[PDB]
Design a protein around this nucleic acid. Structure first.
Ligand SMILES: [Mg+2]
Lengths: 1315, 49, 592
DNA sequence: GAGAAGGTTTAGAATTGTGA
DNA sequence: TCACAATTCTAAAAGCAAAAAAGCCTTCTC
RNA sequence: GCUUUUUUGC
């Protein structure tokens, strides 16, 4: 099938792989999250419900008067989005929560409430997300970028070999909670087990166990297995499990049953224990020498004296053995300790510690945490109980609990966020198990451990923090005051909540200013996941391994889109198909392949879960039913590309386009560039500035349409219908009746945006792209925003390049442009500059805006109304006047250089100052447009009502001739019978009446909103903003680029008579250097140039056979021939179903080259490019034979021409040039100001002084840092001497030296200059 | 060019000389810095002769 | 005034930090004064004196001890010490590095027609830097009476100021400086030439010195005022007095990429062309044959040339003879200065050949002929590079016919070793090492195959039986001639691009058998990305460490000056050629 | 409304903690 | 006595440029 | 005319 709007230009679409999953809605990442944030939520797991339920109910100190939660509602905005931009105030919504305070009785746990007082309390606004994923905070449009951080859980790191200077392997076990304190267990070269909290001073680990209601016996039982010694008549026969002996030496004669099983001197091996277990050896005698080498487990106390015989965890020596041997106890418990399979780490740690009891442990911790205050028993108890085991102050998130349990091989995923003794001891045991050798560490680059926050989760955390501050306030107040008098609102005051939310949105490291100079720039500023922010690493401390690309980013994060510079690899971009888990982790889809057949069920796989399977490759040839044709297919089992059999696979990749972000998928022939060139191309295609007349790619990737529609730039139809009225300022679409609601007789009005400033000072307009009477179906564009063309994404123009050297005017990266391109305004852009005059009320006279200006003639006054403000449409230049304002001479002058007309003036004034005459004129104008537009919103409804009257008034004493005599209104009092017909007439009259009422009631408010003043900064009368609109051309110095990272700066604008011209006469339009390509291996550009030449050849053939008119039969035949060419091309357009009028419009849209779509990784091939070149008339090698314009001679060595798509980046030479001779100087250190806004001078940093010292130029340096910069009297004398005619200086001495001298002097350090 | 000054009601220690690490005052009075700062911040008494 | 309280825009005052700290100390001194006046109990006077000590401790050096004091914002405020030390104190920010008047900035572009000591400076920028000189010359010529009138005149840009400006711009060097001035040649003086535009036009031959291509860089121009400054720029810095690197002997005017391609393509030879074998009376006849289409720029020809050998002490002795050269080499000979010998331009002039040719010019003749020669070399290189029309197409990089077979055989071999491992006869580590070895062998074989295919691809017949010559392919020329690129890049463009390294150094066991003229599937591209991201991160995080190293080195060795003529000592160092096991690495001649 | 008004990554040097 | 050696704390971490937005004390009161 | 945050270029 084909739409009736995608049928105007069909992209000849190469590419063999029939994809199954369509590209999802690219903005879902932020739309879904902020949808979750605000949603009236039964069962309240996420959103504001979660926060309120967490913080409420609030209970005083048994004050018998407590407050709970009922419901919450979001009101409506006071202002819609567009006027929020126009005015400057946040697009918000008010939050109202149904609180309910209830007063108990005396001694009333069981006692019913005596008073119930309820209302809605107003607590603060919350900014809302416009339907494009953006927020409007103060006029400006901000984006709250996602954040990638470490998921809460337990992480066992190595610290491999960079400690102790001896290649020891330490081991660490960290607990990261969602809100609390990091708890760390760690090892020491001496093989102790230490703990620490908050990365502060370190302690022996076991102390925490001593604080958890434990004695030494329990600890030893926990972390060791017991061994039994039995005092016997013959030297302590010992009970032996064979498995406890493997990998050990023979220190004695292993004997039993009157038999020696294993002899001394040898070593126990696998066969030895085999012999032992086959024989079922129970007990073995052993000399006391080996018994002396174990440590006693339990504290042993004499039954006679009631005194200790031998405390635990100390070496058994022959003296102690003798003393205890006759004590009468014949059973001794020791600790199995093999230096390979086990280790007594806890034993030595118990040796180290200075504590013995719970009191000792708690006081040690308390002295550890807060020094200065002497310890107190109860305070320390409360503290250590509150530091980890009070859910109000510590909390693993539910994701934290899931990771915690999964890591420790537990079985449930649900749990409780408060820590437990079992969990701590189990972490300890896992850490020791890693130390022993069993188990392996967990890295921190794995995308299983890293988790995406978003606007929803960040906003919830901020709102929660604010609300707990407020509940602290209400709790403090609620224990006091007379309860029955106060309504439940006079204690909240809502200040902290609004303060916290506004502060997070307005000024946060992630809620940042929007990049808006494209549709691509926005749609890829929103799908950005930033490693930085509060609760994340930082650029300086950022490591060197996190910046690298892990083998598990396949399908989740782009490898070739990351802004090089200080933060490379910390700011990632989210892949095309990647979605986010229920918890935060990133999924990507995969086709299920049960047997060899590749089934068509798609399962989303997370990061950890992707390793176990063996996942096939996106491009693995399969033959029309799903058997992998090849014998050995490629897969990626566990982070290791490898080669697997025809049937081991358990998944396949959805699409070949799923590994790359959206911005890197618009580059054609990506699989021919180097990776670096692809990165630079993906990064410069986001700076392209939108030009006057957009031009389609003509070699694309089929992602232009989705990118253009999936941003909010283009006005797309909501319900399909038939166009009814088109215009440069609005569109009116008549909805088809089938889609229409049951009533309301709706039509669709679209108010196109016209010449407004973007954040980057560009022009965002929208051109209608539909004619009158044009049927538009649901979901089809109507208005082509900037850099958009028929709903595609047109970032630049497609230009006829030739690759050759041309007299060194394209030496390194320079470009050599024809003047034919300046002539046509191909690369001309429109910038808009918003200048502001702030009219304060100063002292020495309150200021004004009078047009009267002293000390000026009539040159400056000829471009003003009598109020001084400029007529809308007046060209101005540097140093002119735009607003009249004089001292009691602060008139807003045009700053230097900025030129062009004045397209818009806006004046806001506060309620209290009389509007001035131009304010009167402007507000009246706005009122008139409001009334006109909202009378236009009246429609055929009333005419339909009159027709209904006429139909009901068909006859029955009716004047058929006089129906059209008088206006249609008076059709109700005419003659009629006395039946239901007259009642229906009265009902129609009623309808007419409430139609008036309903429209008038809405129309009134606009008067109020327009009339009123607005909130300025305290102390200011009124803000006047002018909107100049310069128009930038192209010129030498302007930076230009392609899509493959082949940037360069325009060097010459060469006359058209000089360009090389092929024999047919057509001059070449850009000349690019060949020497670029082989070094920086971007072969993409050559292939794009050849495919462009092929496509424009086809377009020329169509334009020839159309201009020199030939019948539509030939056109459909040729277009079909062009649309077949290929092999297994998946498109297969059927052209015989167009009716010889769709073909004509189409072929008229193809007279400028046939577009092509070359998907990212299975694009066209060389052979098919050659075929398409043949289908035109062009030489197959790609290279034509050119002539030299200046001499007319022929170039040896045939040269490569073609059509390459060139962008124009926003680094314009006229915004970079700057110069200074003498201006204004800073105050403290009398040195020139820095910047181009200030008339500033160039910094002469240290390195340049070193260069000058190296040459030996001493006088140049002296005049460079004494006269030209800083010596005040010296530089005035220098200026005077230069004007006079004598070139000489009296240096003197700096005045930024005396500053230093005095600042050191204002310490206690007398510094002076000597003889 | 013209400075000013403030008369402290009592003496006070110059931090630069006190805790430059190494500290001038410390190894001029051959006695550690922990106790010197403790005395300075009014937490112990130091005898003289 | 060293801590001003400046009324910001409209109606508010911005209080510096020090005013806050001084205010606090004054308040707390007043409190202590009153308390000691009233003779209050011990505890509170102790507390107050402690907290005065604390206020001053924060005043003089904030945050040196715990609990750094914070102001309105959560961050610490800046004391005296923090106003001196650090990267933002007066020592590194306002004393060693100053902002400077009479100085502009703009993009740099390429002007390939300037002489080696000129720079094209825009008219707007130039008129703005040289304003006081313009005032001076207007006043001296009398066209305006007073500085007010002169200022109005220049601000309105009458028709006279342009000729005045061209007079005051005559012999007035300006210093061009690129942003990270790394070594001595990052600042250079130049003669301005007024230009219409907004980009500084910079002669190509100096780019290498600046390390500045034209992808949108920017340079800052400063103006010397006094006469010592102008003489210093003219005599010490001028771009002609800097043609040898300071760090070693090598020249710093190596002709770089387009010019070397023009000279290489011009001075080559092909076994059949128009006008092969004729005899030409001299270089001039060669030029007027090539310019009229009767012969090819490179066709084997006998020519009668005269070279000047200066065997006579400071006197040139002519020698006439017949040589076997091509039209290209004679045309290039028409520019070489007098005293050179003819064999110096009679081979395919790569980049090394051209650099040594300039070195021998400099050594035999001096400076001025070498400057003229470098200019003429640039102009001729550009002209004949343009006329060659040397372009690059897809067919100019040919897959060797044998690559298919080589990769198939290596696949068979690795299958054999994998089956050997299936039987357990081969240990894992040995299996891995041997697989890596056979893949390296296959890569080497295919690379040599393609190089043999390219390096002699052309086959052509003179008047009969065939003949093999070095190939005129475009990409082979770009790499061979030293223009831009090496053999590794061409290997990746044509033959398989070898094996790739996982970030941990481990070499993956599945090479990228597919070059760039063919596709890379998704996985091969992902592996390539591992490799590339490592390098980008290296550069980004290495520039900073290099800058810090250089800063330390300078701030140590910033006192050595050459002060005497001979300290008069007999000690020294015994230098001998170094040997790192194998052959001699650094020979004695270069050593001493 | 608004005036008052007290508020990582390493390295190098220095300490002290057993350990003689 | 007096010597290593382990723990603690301080010092540094390229340059130039442009843009944008924020921003200048809580409270206590008449 | 100062501090911070963010971004971008080289
Ligand atoms: Mg550059």
């Amino acid at each position: 099938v084909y739409s009736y709007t995608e049928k105007k230009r069909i992209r000849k679409d190469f590419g063999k792989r029939p994809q199954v999953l369509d590209v999802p809605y690219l903005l879902s990442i932020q739309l879904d999250s902020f949808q979750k944030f605000i949603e009236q939520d039964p069962e309240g797991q996420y959103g504001l419900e979660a926060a309120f339920r967490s913080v409420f109910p609030i209970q005083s100190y048994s004050g018998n008067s407590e407050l709970q939660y009922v419901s919450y509602r979001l009101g409506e905005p006071v202002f819609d989005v567009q006027e929020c931009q126009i005015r400057g105030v946040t697009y918000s919504a008010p939050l109202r929560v149904k609180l309910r305070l209830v007063i108990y009785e005396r001694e009333a746990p069981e006692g019913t409430v005596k008073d119930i007082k309820e209302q809605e309390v107003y607590m603060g606004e919350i900014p809302l997300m416009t339907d494009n994923g953006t927020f409007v905070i103060n006029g400006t449009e901000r984006v709250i970028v996602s954040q990638l951080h470490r998921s809460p859980g337990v992480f066992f790191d190595s610290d491999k070999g960079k400690t102790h200077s001896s290649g020891k392997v330490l081991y660490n076990a960290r607990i990261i909670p969602y809100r609390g304190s990091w708890l760390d267990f760690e090892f020491d070269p001496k093989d102790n087990l230490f703990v620490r909290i908050d990365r502060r001073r370190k302690l022996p680990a076991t102390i925490i166990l001593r604080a958890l209601n434990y004695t030494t016996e329990q600890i030893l039982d926990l972390f060791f297995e017991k061994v039994i010694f039995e005092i016997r008549d013959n030297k302590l026969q010992m009970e032996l499990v064979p498995e406890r002996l493997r990998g050990e030496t023979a220190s004695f004669d292993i004997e039993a049953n009157g038999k020696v099983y294993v002899e001394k001197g040898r070593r126990i091996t696998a066969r030895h224990i085999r012999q032992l277990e086959k024989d079922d050896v129970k007990l073995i005698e052993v000399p006391v020498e080996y018994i002396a080498g174990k440590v006693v487990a339990k504290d042993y106390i004499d039954e006679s004296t009631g005194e200790l015989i031998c405390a635990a965890n100390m070496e058994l020596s022959l003296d102690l053995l003798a003393k205890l041997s006759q004590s009468g106890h014949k059973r001794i418990e020791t600790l199995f300790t093999n230096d390979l399979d086990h280790g007594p780490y806890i034993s030595e740690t118990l040796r180290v510690d200075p504590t013995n009891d719970r009191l000792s442990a708690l006081v040690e911790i308390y002295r550890m945490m807060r020094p200065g205050e002497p310890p107190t028993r109860e305070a320390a108890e409360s503290l250590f109980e509150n530091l980890f085991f009070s859910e109000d102050r510590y909390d693993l998130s539910a994701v934290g609990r899931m990771k915690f349990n999964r890591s420790l091989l537990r079985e449930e995923i649900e749990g409780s966020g408060i820590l437990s003794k079992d969990d701590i001891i189990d972490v300890m045991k896992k850490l020791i198990d890693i130390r022993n050798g069993k188990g392996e560490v967990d890295d921190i680059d794995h995308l299983g451990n890293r988790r995406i926050r978003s606007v929803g989760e960040m906003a919830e955390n901020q709102f929660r923090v604010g609300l707990v501050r407020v509940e602290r306030a209400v709790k403090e107040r609620l224990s006091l005051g007379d309860l029955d008098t106060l309504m439940p609102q006079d204690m909240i005051n809502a200040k902290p909540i609004s303060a916290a939310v506004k502060e997070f949105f307005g000024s946060s490291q992630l809620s940042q200013f929007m990049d808006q100079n494209n549709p691509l720039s926005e749609i890829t500023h929103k799908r950005r996941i930033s490693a930085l922010g509060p609760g994340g690493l930082t650029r300086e401390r950022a490591g060197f391994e996190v910046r690298d690309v892990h083998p598990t980013h396949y399908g989740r994060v782009c490898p070739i889109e990351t802004p090089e510079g200080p933060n490379i690899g910390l700011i990632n971009s989210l892949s095309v198909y990647a979605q986010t888990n229920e918890y935060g982790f990133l999924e990507t889809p995969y086709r299920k392949v049960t047997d060899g057949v590749v089934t068509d069920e798609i399962h989303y796989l997370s990061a950890i879960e992707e390793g176990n399977y063996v996942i096939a490759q996106a491009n693995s040839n399969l033959d029309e039913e799903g058997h992998f044709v090849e014998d050995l297919v490629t897969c990626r089992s566990k982070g290791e590309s490898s080669l697997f059999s025809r049937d081991q696979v358990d998944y396949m990749d959805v699409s070949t386009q799923q590994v790359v972000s959206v911005g890197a998928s618009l580059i054609p022939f990506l699989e021919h560039d180097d990776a670096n060139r692809a990165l630079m191309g993906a990064n410069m295609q986001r700076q392209a500035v939108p030009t006057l007349r957009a031009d389609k790619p003509l070699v694309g990737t089929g992602m232009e349409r989705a990118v253009a529609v999936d941003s909010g730039v283009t006005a797309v139809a909501k319900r399909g219908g038939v166009v009814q009225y088109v215009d440069a300022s609005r569109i009116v679409i008549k909805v088809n009746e089938d889609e229409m609601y049951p009533g309301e007789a709706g039509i669709d009005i679209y108010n196109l945006t016209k010449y407004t400033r973007s954040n980057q000072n560009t022009c965002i307009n929208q051109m209608p792209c539909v004619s009158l009477g044009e049927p538009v179906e649901r979901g089809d564009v109507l208005a082509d925003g900037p850099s958009t063309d028929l709903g595609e994404l047109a970032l630049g123009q497609n230009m006829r390049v030739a690759f050759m050297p041309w007299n060194g005017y394209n030496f390194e990266d320079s470009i050599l442009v024809s003047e034919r391109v300046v002539q046509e305004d191909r690369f001309t852009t429109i910038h808009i500059q918003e200048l502001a005059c702030v009219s304060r009320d100063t002292k020495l006279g309150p200021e004004e805006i009078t047009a009267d200006i002293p000390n000026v003639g009539e040159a400056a006054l000829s471009k003003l109304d009598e109020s001084g403000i400029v007529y809308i449409g007046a060209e101005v230049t540097g140093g002119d006047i735009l607003v009249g304002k004089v001292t009691p001479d602060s008139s807003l002058r045009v700053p230097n250089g900025v030129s062009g007309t004045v397209i818009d003036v806006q004046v806001f004034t506060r309620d209290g100052v009389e509007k001035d005459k131009r304010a009167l004129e402007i507000e009246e104008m706005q009122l008139k447009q409001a009334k006109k537009d909202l009378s236009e919103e009246l429609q055929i409804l009333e005419a339909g009502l009159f027709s209904r009257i006429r139909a009901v008034l068909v006859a029955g004493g009716v004047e058929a001739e006089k129906l059209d005599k008088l206006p249609r209104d008076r059709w109700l009092e005419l003659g009629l019978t006395d039946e239901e017909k007259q009642n229906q007439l009265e009902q129609l009259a009623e309808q007419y009446d409430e139609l008036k009422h309903e429209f008038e009631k809405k129309l009134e408010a606009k008067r109020r909103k327009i009339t009123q003043g607005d909130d300025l900064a305290p102390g200011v009368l009124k803000i006047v903003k002018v909107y100049l609109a310069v128009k930038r051309r192209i010129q030498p110095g302007d930076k230009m680029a392609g899509r493959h990272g082949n940037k360069g700066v325009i060097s010459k604008i060469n006359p058209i008579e000089d360009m090389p011209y092929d024999e047919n006469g057509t001059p070449v339009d850009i000349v690019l250097n060949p020497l670029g390509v082989p070094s920086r291996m971007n072969i993409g550009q050559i292939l794009e140039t050849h495919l462009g030449m092929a496509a424009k050849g086809i377009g020329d053939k169509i334009n020839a056979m159309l201009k020199q008119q030939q019948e539509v039969a030939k056109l459909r035949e040729f277009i079909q021939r062009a649309y077949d060419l290929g092999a297994d091309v998946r498109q297969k357009v059927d052209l015989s179903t167009f009716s010889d009028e769709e073909v004509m419009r189409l072929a008229e849209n193809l007279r400028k080259g046939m577009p092509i779509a070359t998907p990212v990784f299975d694009g066209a091939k060389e052979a098919e490019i050659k075929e398409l070149l043949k289908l035109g008339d062009l030489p197959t090698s790609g290279q034509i034979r050119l002539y030299d314009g200046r001499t007319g001679e022929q170039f040896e060595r045939p040269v490569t021409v073609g059509y390459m798509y060139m962008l124009k980046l926003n680094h314009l030479v006229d915004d970079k040039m700057h110069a200074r001779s003498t201006g204004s100087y800073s105050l403290v250190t009398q040195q020139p100001l820095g910047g181009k806004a200030q008339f500033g001078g160039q910094r002469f940093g240290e390195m340049e002084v070193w260069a000058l010292e190296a040459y030996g130029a001493a006088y140049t340096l002296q005049e460079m840092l004494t006269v030209k910069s800083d010596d005040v009297n010296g530089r005035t004398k220098m200026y005077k001497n230069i004007v006079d005619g004598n070139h000489q200086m009296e240096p003197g001495m700096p005045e930024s030296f005396n500053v230093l001298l005095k600042e050191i002097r204002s310490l206690g350090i007398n510094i002076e200059l000597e003889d | 060019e013209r400075m000013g000054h403030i008369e402290l009601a009592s003496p006070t220690a110059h931090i630069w000389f006190l805790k430059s690490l190494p500290s001038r005052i410390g190894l001029l009075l051959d006695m550690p810095l922990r106790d010197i700062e403790r005395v300075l911040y009014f937490e112990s008494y130091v005898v003289i002769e | 005034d060293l801590r001003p309280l400046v009324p910001l825009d409209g109606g508010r005052f911005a209080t510096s930090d020090l005013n806050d700290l001084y205010r606090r100390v004054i308040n707390r001194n007043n409190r202590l004064k009153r308390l000691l006046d009233l003779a209050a109990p011990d505890i509170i006077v102790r507390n107050e004196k402690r907290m005065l000590q604390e206020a001053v401790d924060a005043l003089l050096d904030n945050g040196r001890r715990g609990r750094a004091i914070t102001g309105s914002n959560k961050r610490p405020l800046k004391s005296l010490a923090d106003m001196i030390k650090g990267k933002q104190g007066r020592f590194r920010q306002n004393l060693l590095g100053k902002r400077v008047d009479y100085s502009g900035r703009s993009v740099i572009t390429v002007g390939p027609y300037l002489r080696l000591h000129q720079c094209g400076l825009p008219k707007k920028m130039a008129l703005e830097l040289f304003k006081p000189f313009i005032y001076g010359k207007l006043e001296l010529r009398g066209l305006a009476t007073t500085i007010k009138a002169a200022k109005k005149m220049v601000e309105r840009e009458e028709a006279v100021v342009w000729d005045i400006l061209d007079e005051v711009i005559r012999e007035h060097p300006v210093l061009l400086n690129r942003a990270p001035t790394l070594h001595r040649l990052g600042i250079q003086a130049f003669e301005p030439v007024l230009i219409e535009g907004k980009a500084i036009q910079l002669h190509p031959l100096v780019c290498a010195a600046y390390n500045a291509d034209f992808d949108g860089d920017q340079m800052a121009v400063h103006v010397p005022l006094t006469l010592e400054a102008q003489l210093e720029a003219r005599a010490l810095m001028m771009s002609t007095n800097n043609i040898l690197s300071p760090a070693n002997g090598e020249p710093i005017i190596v002709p770089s990429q387009d010019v070397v391609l023009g000279l290489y393509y011009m001075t080559r030879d092909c076994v059949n062309a128009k006008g092969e074998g004729m005899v030409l009376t001299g270089p001039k006849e060669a030029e007027r044959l090539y310019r009229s289409g009767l012969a090819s720029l490179h066709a084997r020809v006998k020519v009668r040339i005269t070279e000047y050998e200066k065997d006579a002490n400071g006197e040139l002795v002519a020698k006439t003879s017949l040589k076997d050269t091509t039209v290209g080499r004679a045309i290039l000979w028409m520019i070489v200065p007098k005293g050179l010998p003819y064999s110096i331009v009679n081979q395919a002039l790569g980049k090394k050949a051209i650099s040594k040719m300039l070195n021998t010019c400099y050594r035999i003749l001096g400076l001025k002929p070498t400057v003229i020669f470098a200019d003429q070399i640039m102009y001729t290189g550009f002209a004949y590079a343009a006329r060659s029309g040397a372009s690059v197409g897809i067919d100019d990089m040919v897959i060797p016919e044998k690559k298919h077979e080589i990769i198939s055989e290596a696949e068979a071999e690795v299958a054999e070793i994998q089956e050997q491992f299936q039987s357990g006869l081969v240990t894992a580590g040995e299996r891995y090492n041997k697989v890596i070895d056979i893949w390296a062998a296959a890569n080497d074989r295919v690379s040599k195959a393609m190089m043999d295919n390219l390096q002699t691809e052309t086959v052509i017949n003179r008047d009969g039986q065939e003949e093999k010559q070095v190939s005129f392919n475009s990409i082979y020329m770009m790499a061979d001639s030293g223009a831009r690129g090496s053999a590794a890049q061409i290997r990746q463009l044509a033959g398989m691009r070898g094996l790739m390294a996982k970030p941990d150094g481990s070499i993956i066991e599945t090479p990228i058998t597919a070059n760039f003229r063919e596709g890379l599937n998704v996985l091969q591209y992902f592996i390539s990305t591992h490799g590339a991201r490592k390098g980008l991160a290296d550069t980004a995080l290495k520039t900073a460490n290099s800058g810090y190293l250089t800063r330390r080195l300078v701030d140590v060795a910033q006192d050595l000056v050459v002060t005497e003529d001979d300290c008069g000592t007999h000690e020294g160092i015994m230098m001998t050629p170094v040997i790192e096991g194998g052959d001699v690495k650094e020979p004695l001649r270069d050593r001493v």
